[PDB]
């Protein structure tokens, strides 16, 4: 209802690459898809760049030393998806 439905929003912003560790995670989830990690991160005002793994999400407020560890079903993402492009 309302005019909120008239406009659409982007919810897809995942990237299957590598998990993260050794960083300064402020909160982590136990989901299977980054989608669930996005909804939980939305509730947190300290999340910006989440990072899902084989079965564990990881929302990060900022970059520090969070490095990869494995690519087994690892799907990490960032705040922005598509920016600065023709």
Residue pair 16/42 in contact (Cβ under 8 Å)? The answer is no
Decide if 67 contacts 20 (C-beta within 8 A): yes
Distance CA 84, CA 65 (A): 26
Q: Classify residue 48 as exposed, middle or buried by CB count within 10 Å of its CB (0-12, 13-18, 19+).
A: middle
Query: 């929003």: which residue's tokens?
Result: 9
Domain 1-86: CATH superfamily is: Hepatocyte Growth Factor (3.50.4.10)
Cβ-Cβ contacts under 8 Å for 49 (sequence gap 6 or more): 59, 60, 62, 63, 76, 77, 78, 79
Sheet holding 75-76, edge to edge: 15-16, 75-76, 51-52
Of 17, 19, 23, nearest to 54 by C-alpha is: 19
């Amino acid at each position: 209802d309302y005019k909120d439905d008239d406009d659409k929003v982007k919810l897809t912003c995942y990237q299957n690459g590598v998990s993260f560790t050794g960083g300064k995670a402020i909160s982590e989830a136990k989901a299977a898809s980054s989608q669930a990690c996005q909804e939980l991160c939305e509730k947190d005002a300290k999340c910006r760049f989440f990072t899902l793994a084989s079965g564990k999400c990881s929302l990060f407020a900022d970059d520090a030393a969070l490095r990869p560890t494995k690519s087994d079903g690892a799907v990490s993402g960032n705040k922005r998806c598509i920016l600065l492009e023709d």
